Structures are given as C-alpha cells and as structure tokens.
C-alpha cells in the first residue's frame, strides 16, 4: 500500500558463499545509490562481491526493462542474506576420529527502489501542517508520508 510499485524483488539464490562473508559486503550497500554501489563492488577486495555485483546489475537491468524506470533514480532499499541448504563433507583427522566440514550456501535478495515515483505527491506536501484539504473525504495521502500517521 505505501509502495508496492516502488520496487522489484530480484532474488538470486543458491549462491555458494557463506552467509557471514556475504553480510560483510551487503551491510555496506543497504541504502545507497545504485551507481555508487557498482563503483564500490568492482574495486572492493572480496570474493563476496562478484555474485552480489551480478545480482545488483541484473536487478537494475530487470527494473529498467520490466517496470521501465531510470537506473539513475533508484537505490538499494532492502538487502537481505539468509541461510541456504547446507552440504556436509566428513573429513578425517589424526588418530582415527573424524569431523565434518560444511559447504555453506546462501539465498540473497535485493529490493531496489525508485526515489521519485511518489515525489509528485510528497513534494506537494511541502504545504505546511494545519491544512487538511478535505477533497475525496480523506483522498490520496498514500506515498510514504514517513514522519507520522497520527490520524485519530
């Protein structure tokens, strides 16, 4: 309701990459410009970046083709990294006892977001507080009003 069309949830998943090492990288780009993010991810010194970069660029291309809004507008709203499907090798050790080493995986998801979709509506509410323009009984104040929903 407050958004719904301000996004595109590209969710590239089953990436062979531990979740903590993915959260090193993804915690930095939660809420940046997309241009900036791409410049970061190519210069960063991590194996973690490459599959993230691929998904950021795929997500932005997806957003430009499918829903048709400008790449210069958008940002990374919700980045999120969840536990995948764990594989378990059984390695030997000294003196006959044996221990498991795990091949961890992940499920990465990125929700992009255009800044200026609901800007026509928000910039209009530069109109100062005691206004209440009662036109359609309440109407379209539905565009991330952000600060309060004190409508008792």
């Amino acid at each position: 309701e407050p958004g719904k069309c301000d996004e595109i949830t590209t969710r590239g998943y089953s990436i062979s990459m531990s979740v903590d090492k993915a959260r090193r990288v993804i915690d930095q780009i939660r809420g940046r410009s997309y241009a900036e993010t791409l410049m970061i991810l190519e210069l960063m010194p991590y194996r973690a970046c490459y599959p993230i970069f691929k998904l950021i660029y795929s997500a932005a291309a997806n957003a430009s083709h499918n829903k048709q809004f400008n790449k210069a507008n958008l940002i990374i709203s919700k980045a999120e990294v969840n536990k995948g499907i764990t594989l378990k090798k059984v390695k030997p050790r000294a003196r006959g006892r044996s221990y498991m080493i795990k091949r961890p995986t992940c499920h990465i998801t990125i929700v992009l977001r255009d800044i200026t979709h609901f800007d026509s509506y928000d910039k209009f509410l530069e109109s100062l507080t005691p206004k209440k323009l009662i036109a359609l009984l309440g109407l379209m104040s539905t565009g991330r009003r952000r600060e309060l929903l004190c409508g008792r």
Binding site: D20, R23, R24, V25, D27, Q28, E36, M39, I40, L43, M44, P45, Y46
Partner: peptide, 14 residues
Amino acid sequence: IWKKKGYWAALKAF
C-alpha cells in the same frame, strides 16, 4: 565489529 572491518574496506574502495 568484524563486519565493520568490511565497512572500512568499502570506504577505502569507494
């Protein structure tokens, strides 16, 4: 803190 190590690297790469 370990993820903040990552943050520092990100700043430098930027």
